[PDB]
Coordinates of N, CA, C and O in Angstrom, one line a residue:
Chain A
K44 N 130.0 143.0 112.1 CA 129.2 142.7 111.4 C 129.2 141.1 112.3 O 130.4 140.3 111.9
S45 N 127.9 140.6 112.7 CA 128.1 139.6 113.9 C 128.6 138.3 113.1 O 127.5 138.0 112.7
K46 N 129.3 137.9 113.3 CA 129.9 136.6 113.2 C 129.0 135.4 113.2 O 129.3 135.4 114.6
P47 N 128.0 134.6 113.1 CA 127.2 133.8 113.6 C 128.1 132.7 113.7 O 128.8 132.3 113.3
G48 N 128.0 132.0 114.8 CA 128.6 131.1 115.3 C 128.3 129.9 114.9 O 127.2 129.6 114.4
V49 N 129.2 128.7 114.7 CA 128.8 127.2 114.6 C 128.1 127.2 115.3 O 128.9 127.1 116.8
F50 N 127.0 126.0 115.7 CA 126.1 126.0 116.4 C 125.5 126.9 117.6 O 125.2 127.1 118.3
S51 N 125.2 128.1 116.1 CA 124.0 128.9 116.7 C 123.1 128.5 116.5 O 122.0 129.2 117.1
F52 N 122.5 127.3 115.8 CA 121.8 126.7 115.6 C 120.7 125.9 116.7 O 119.8 125.7 116.9
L53 N 121.6 125.9 118.1 CA 121.4 125.3 119.1 C 120.9 126.4 120.0 O 120.3 126.4 121.0
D54 N 120.9 127.9 119.5 CA 120.8 129.0 120.4 C 119.4 129.4 120.7 O 119.0 129.5 122.3
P55 N 118.2 129.0 119.9 CA 117.1 128.6 120.7 C 116.6 128.1 121.7 O 115.9 128.3 122.7
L56 N 117.3 126.7 122.2 CA 117.3 126.3 123.3 C 118.4 126.2 124.0 O 119.5 126.0 123.8
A57 N 118.3 126.4 125.6 CA 119.3 126.2 126.3 C 120.5 125.1 126.4 O 119.6 124.3 126.1
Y58 N 121.3 125.4 126.7 CA 122.1 124.3 127.1 C 121.8 123.1 127.8 O 121.5 122.3 127.3
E59 N 121.2 123.6 128.9 CA 120.5 122.8 130.0 C 119.2 121.9 129.3 O 119.8 120.6 129.9
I60 N 118.6 122.1 128.6 CA 117.6 121.6 128.0 C 118.4 120.3 127.0 O 117.9 119.4 126.7
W61 N 119.2 120.6 126.4 CA 119.9 119.5 125.1 C 120.5 118.7 126.2 O 120.3 117.7 126.0
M62 N 121.2 119.4 127.5 CA 121.9 118.3 128.3 C 120.3 117.2 128.5 O 120.8 115.8 129.0
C63 N 119.7 117.8 129.1 CA 118.9 116.8 129.6 C 117.7 116.1 128.5 O 117.4 114.7 129.2
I64 N 117.6 116.6 127.4 CA 117.2 115.7 126.2 C 117.9 114.3 126.1 O 117.5 113.6 125.7
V65 N 119.3 114.7 125.9 CA 120.3 113.5 126.0 C 120.0 112.5 127.0 O 119.8 111.2 126.9
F66 N 119.9 113.4 128.4 CA 119.6 112.0 129.3 C 118.5 111.3 129.4 O 118.3 110.5 129.7
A67 N 117.2 112.3 129.2 CA 115.6 111.5 129.0 C 116.0 110.3 127.7 O 115.4 109.3 128.1
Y68 N 116.7 110.6 126.5 CA 117.0 109.9 125.6 C 117.3 108.6 126.2 O 116.8 107.4 126.0
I69 N 118.3 108.6 126.8 CA 119.1 107.4 127.4 C 118.2 106.6 128.2 O 118.1 105.3 128.4
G70 N 117.6 107.1 129.1 CA 116.8 106.7 130.1 C 115.3 106.1 129.4 O 114.7 104.8 130.2
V71 N 114.8 106.6 128.7 CA 114.0 106.2 127.6 C 114.0 105.2 127.1 O 113.5 103.8 126.8
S72 N 115.7 105.2 126.5 CA 115.9 103.9 125.6 C 115.9 102.6 126.6 O 115.5 101.5 126.2
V73 N 116.7 102.8 127.9 CA 116.9 102.0 128.8 C 115.7 101.4 129.5 O 115.2 99.8 129.5
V74 N 114.6 102.4 129.7 CA 113.3 101.7 130.6 C 112.8 100.6 129.5 O 111.9 99.9 129.8
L75 N 112.6 101.4 128.0 CA 112.0 100.4 126.7 C 112.4 99.1 126.8 O 111.7 98.4 126.9
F76 N 113.5 99.3 126.8 CA 114.6 98.0 126.6 C 114.3 96.9 128.0 O 113.5 95.8 127.7
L77 N 114.4 97.5 129.0 CA 113.5 96.5 130.1 C 113.0 96.3 130.3 O 112.4 94.9 130.3
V78 N 111.1 97.0 130.2 CA 110.0 96.7 130.3 C 109.7 95.8 128.7 O 108.3 95.1 128.9
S79 N 110.5 95.5 127.8 CA 110.1 94.8 126.9 C 111.0 93.4 126.4 O 110.7 92.3 125.8
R80 N 111.8 93.3 127.7 CA 112.9 92.3 127.5 C 113.5 91.7 129.0 O 114.5 91.6 129.6
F81 N 112.0 91.8 129.9 CA 112.3 91.4 131.1 C 111.6 90.1 131.7 O 112.7 89.3 132.0
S82 N 110.2 89.9 130.7 CA 109.5 89.0 131.3 C 109.7 87.8 130.4 O 109.5 88.0 129.5
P83 N 109.9 86.5 131.2 CA 109.9 85.5 130.5 C 108.6 84.7 129.7 O 108.0 83.8 130.3
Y84 N 108.0 85.6 129.0 CA 107.0 85.3 128.4 C 106.7 84.5 127.3 O 107.8 84.1 126.5
Chain B
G207 N 88.8 188.5 153.7 CA 89.3 190.0 153.5 C 90.3 190.7 153.3 O 90.2 191.8 153.4
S208 N 90.9 189.8 153.1 CA 92.5 190.0 151.9 C 91.9 190.6 150.6 O 90.9 190.2 150.0
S209 N 92.9 191.9 149.9 CA 92.4 192.3 149.3 C 93.1 191.4 147.7 O 93.0 191.9 146.6
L210 N 93.6 190.4 148.0 CA 94.3 189.3 147.1 C 93.1 188.3 146.8 O 93.5 187.5 145.6
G211 N 92.0 188.5 147.0 CA 91.0 186.9 146.8 C 91.1 187.0 145.2 O 91.4 186.0 144.6
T212 N 90.6 188.2 144.9 CA 89.7 188.4 143.4 C 90.7 188.2 142.6 O 91.1 187.6 141.3
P213 N 92.0 188.9 142.6 CA 93.0 188.9 142.0 C 94.0 187.4 141.5 O 94.1 186.6 140.4
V214 N 93.9 186.6 142.6 CA 94.4 185.4 142.6 C 93.6 184.2 141.8 O 93.8 183.5 140.9
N215 N 92.3 184.8 141.9 CA 91.5 183.7 141.5 C 91.4 183.7 139.8 O 91.5 183.0 139.2
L216 N 91.0 185.1 139.5 CA 91.6 185.6 138.0 C 92.8 185.3 137.7 O 92.9 184.6 136.4
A217 N 93.8 185.1 138.5 CA 95.1 184.5 138.0 C 95.2 183.3 137.7 O 95.7 183.1 136.4
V218 N 94.6 182.3 138.4 CA 94.7 181.0 138.0 C 93.9 180.6 137.2 O 94.3 180.1 136.4
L219 N 92.6 181.4 137.1 CA 91.9 181.2 136.0 C 92.5 181.6 134.4 O 92.4 180.8 133.5
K220 N 93.2 182.6 134.7 CA 94.1 182.8 133.1 C 94.9 181.7 132.8 O 95.1 181.5 131.9
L221 N 95.8 181.4 133.7 CA 96.7 180.7 133.7 C 96.2 179.2 133.1 O 96.9 178.5 132.2
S222 N 94.9 178.5 133.7 CA 94.8 177.4 133.4 C 94.1 177.9 131.9 O 94.6 176.7 131.5
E223 N 93.5 178.6 131.8 CA 92.8 178.8 130.2 C 93.8 178.9 129.1 O 93.6 178.6 128.1
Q224 N 94.9 179.7 129.5 CA 96.1 179.9 128.5 C 96.9 178.5 128.2 O 97.5 178.1 127.2
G225 N 97.4 177.8 129.5 CA 97.5 176.6 129.7 C 99.1 176.4 130.3 O 99.8 175.6 130.3
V226 N 99.5 177.2 131.3 CA 100.6 177.3 131.7 C 100.7 176.4 133.0 O 101.7 175.9 133.0
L227 N 99.5 176.0 133.9 CA 99.4 174.8 134.8 C 99.7 173.5 134.4 O 100.6 172.7 134.7
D228 N 99.4 173.1 133.2 CA 99.6 171.8 132.3 C 101.2 172.0 131.8 O 101.7 170.8 132.3
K229 N 101.6 172.9 131.7 CA 103.2 173.0 131.2 C 103.9 172.9 132.5 O 105.0 171.8 132.5
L230 N 103.6 173.4 133.5 CA 104.1 173.5 134.5 C 104.3 171.8 135.0 O 105.5 171.2 135.7
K231 N 103.2 171.2 135.0 CA 102.8 169.6 135.5 C 103.7 168.8 134.7 O 104.6 167.8 135.3
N232 N 103.9 169.1 133.6 CA 104.3 168.3 132.5 C 105.9 168.5 132.7 O 107.1 167.9 132.9
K233 N 106.5 170.0 133.0 CA 107.7 169.9 133.7 C 108.5 169.4 134.5 O 109.5 169.1 134.9
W234 N 107.7 169.5 135.9 CA 108.0 168.9 137.1 C 107.7 167.5 137.5 O 107.9 166.7 138.4
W235 N 106.6 166.8 136.6 CA 106.2 165.2 136.6 C 106.8 164.2 135.8 O 107.3 163.2 136.1
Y236 N 107.0 164.4 134.4 CA 107.0 163.7 133.2 C 108.4 163.9 132.9 O 109.2 163.4 132.7
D237 N 108.7 165.6 132.5 CA 110.0 166.0 132.0 C 110.5 166.1 133.9 O 109.6 166.7 134.5
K238 N 111.8 166.6 133.8 CA 112.6 166.3 134.9 C 112.2 165.2 135.6 O 112.5 165.1 136.5
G239 N 112.0 163.9 135.2 CA 111.2 162.9 135.1 C 112.3 161.5 134.8 O 112.4 161.8 133.6
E240 N 112.7 160.8 135.4 CA 113.9 160.3 135.5 C 113.7 158.9 134.0 O 114.0 159.1 133.0
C241 N 112.4 158.0 134.3 CA 112.0 157.1 133.3 C 111.2 158.0 132.4 O 109.8 158.2 132.9
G242 N 111.0 157.7 130.9 CA 110.1 158.0 130.0 C 109.3 157.1 130.1 O 108.5 156.3 131.1
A243 N 108.7 156.7 128.6 CA 107.2 155.8 128.5 C 107.6 155.3 127.0 O 108.3 155.7 126.5
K244 N 110.9 145.4 122.6 CA 112.2 145.6 121.9 C 113.4 144.7 122.6 O 114.7 144.4 121.5
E245 N 113.6 144.2 123.8 CA 114.7 143.7 124.3 C 114.6 142.4 123.1 O 113.9 141.7 122.8
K246 N 115.7 142.0 122.9 CA 116.5 140.8 122.0 C 116.0 139.3 122.8 O 115.9 139.3 124.3
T247 N 115.2 138.6 122.2 CA 114.6 137.2 122.7 C 115.5 136.5 123.2 O 116.7 136.4 123.0
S248 N 115.0 135.9 124.2 CA 115.9 135.1 125.2 C 115.7 133.3 124.8 O 114.5 133.2 124.4
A249 N 116.4 132.8 124.7 CA 116.6 131.4 124.5 C 116.1 130.9 125.8 O 115.9 130.7 126.9
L250 N 115.3 129.5 125.3 CA 114.2 129.1 126.3 C 115.1 127.9 127.3 O 116.0 127.6 127.0
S251 N 114.4 128.4 128.4 CA 115.4 127.8 129.9 C 114.3 126.4 130.0 O 113.4 126.1 129.9
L252 N 115.5 125.9 131.1 CA 114.7 124.7 131.4 C 113.3 124.6 132.2 O 112.5 123.8 132.0

């Protein structure tokens, strides 16, 4: 009786995709902050 | 000029009509054949 793993809900996407999702989240947030709070307008 | 012409002609015709040759082909091509004629789904990759 295959006991489903906790964090089996992540199985549809590979570990690399989640990793790069986190990386892209950080990059997007930083670029947004930058391009919103740089110009002394 | 061999006396074996008509008999072999009739033999192959009889075999074809009854179905021996097809069985032999199945035996030596499909049967006696390694691969005959579902995989779990994979997680998406980058």
